[PDB]
Amino acid sequence: XXXXXXXXXXXXXXXXYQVLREKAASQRRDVERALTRFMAKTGETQSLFKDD
Amino acid sequence: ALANSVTPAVSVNNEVRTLDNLNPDVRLILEEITRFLNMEKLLPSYRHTITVSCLRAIRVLQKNGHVPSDPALFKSYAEYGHFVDIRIAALEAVVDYTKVDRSYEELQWLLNMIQNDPVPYVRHKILNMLTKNPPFTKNMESPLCNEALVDQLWKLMNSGTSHDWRLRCGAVDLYFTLFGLSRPSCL
């Protein structure tokens, strides 16, 4: 069958529900912290300690 | 619930002032309250109630010696052009700050803003929860109300309070709490 016949390729399955929504919530947390740092260092700033 | 994660016993000797970048889960709580404060600065969803809970959390962290006892954030959120709830939470915070810490100057600013602001309800609730949460407690007078604060409170009962009846009613409540059925031990 290595020479005559053939097959078909998909090459992408994970199917892990809890892992998928962990990845989605981690990406949401990353977007939160990224925009947090962005407009944290962008605009008018008052800190918690001195010069955070 | 993050505000109800009171951990008062981290600073054993001096851990208040950016020594450890204080550790280990208090910093994660600071990360989350920073995220929610900046989200409600960007999103805002319904009255900045998340910001009210975050300011209560920041005051609890100031009461546990992690973030140092500095009113300047609460001062900048007791300003005029905000929502009523943000301002009322920052004013509850600075009333409890004047209770615990010995900040006389922010009390002077608080009385001057009792005199000078156009919104009645913030004055109402300043006087209400200043009576509920009193500094300068009767017959426990360490921060020395007798110097000139008795005079200025007597003035604020007499003058500058012809606006509403209830503001001098709250000042009557103030003299109920502060040196009530006696002389104030001045002369």
Side-chain angles (χ1 to χ4, degrees):
Chain A
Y17 173 77
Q18 185 177 2
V19 180
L20 282 171
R21 287 184 178 179
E22 282 180 352
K23 290 292 288 184
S26 68
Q27 186 177 2
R28 184 69 176 172
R29 183 182 178 181
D30 288 330
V31 171
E32 285 177 352
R33 190 174 182 177
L35 186 60
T36 297
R37 290 178 181 176
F38 177 74
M39 286 186 71
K41 289 184 179 180
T42 299
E44 292 180 353
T45 301
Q46 292 178 357
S47 67
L48 293 167
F49 294 159
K50 291 183 180 180
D51 290 330
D52 286 337
Chain B
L2 294 174
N4 205 358
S5 66
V6 176
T7 309
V10 171
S11 66
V12 177
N13 291 318
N14 286 316
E15 293 179 354
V16 185
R17 296 176 181 89
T18 323
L19 298 175
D20 292 330
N21 289 318
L22 293 178
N23 52 4
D25 293 331
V26 180
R27 187 176 179 178
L28 296 173
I29 298 169
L30 289 174
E31 289 179 354
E32 282 177 344
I33 65 172
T34 296
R35 286 172 183 170
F36 281 106
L37 284 172
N38 294 320
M39 283 172 70
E40 289 291 327
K41 188 72 173 179
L42 286 177
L43 293 176
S45 65
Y46 193 71
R47 298 184 179 176
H48 302 275
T49 306
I50 287 173
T51 303
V52 172
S53 66
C54 286
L55 290 180
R56 292 180 182 177
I58 288 168
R59 182 163 178 82
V60 169
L61 291 171
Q62 290 180 357
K63 287 183 178 180
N64 292 318
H66 302 288
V67 176
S69 65
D70 292 331
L73 296 175
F74 293 153
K75 179 71 169 66
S76 66
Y77 287 161
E79 294 177 352
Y80 176 72
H82 292 285
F83 192 73
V84 182
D85 288 334
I86 305 167
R87 189 174 181 178
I88 202 172
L91 285 164
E92 291 172 359
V94 73
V95 164
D96 286 329
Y97 183 76
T98 310
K99 183 177 179 180
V100 176
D101 199 359
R102 201 177 179 178
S103 180
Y104 180 74
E105 295 178 353
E106 293 292 327
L107 185 66
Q108 187 67 41
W109 178 70
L110 184 63
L111 269 66
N112 289 318
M113 195 180 74
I114 288 169
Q115 180 62 42
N116 195 1
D117 54 349
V119 177
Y121 186 77
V122 293
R123 292 179 181 177
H124 170 73
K125 294 293 289 184
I126 282 170
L127 295 172
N128 195 1
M129 291 181 71
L130 186 63
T131 304
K132 290 181 181 178
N133 290 318
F136 285 79
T137 309
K138 182 178 178 178
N139 291 318
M140 293 175 71
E141 186 178 359
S142 60
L144 294 174
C145 185
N146 289 121
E147 295 177 354
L149 187 60
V150 180
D151 291 332
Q152 291 182 356
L153 284 171
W154 184 252
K155 288 180 181 179
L156 289 175
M157 296 181 75
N158 289 319
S159 65
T161 322
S162 66
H163 303 286
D164 294 329
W165 303 98
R166 72 176 183 181
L167 302 177
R168 63 179 63 191
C169 290
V172 168
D173 295 331
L174 289 176
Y175 278 6
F176 182 74
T177 303
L178 310 179
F179 48 88
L181 293 176
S182 67
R183 290 288 185 183
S185 69
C186 295
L187 291 174

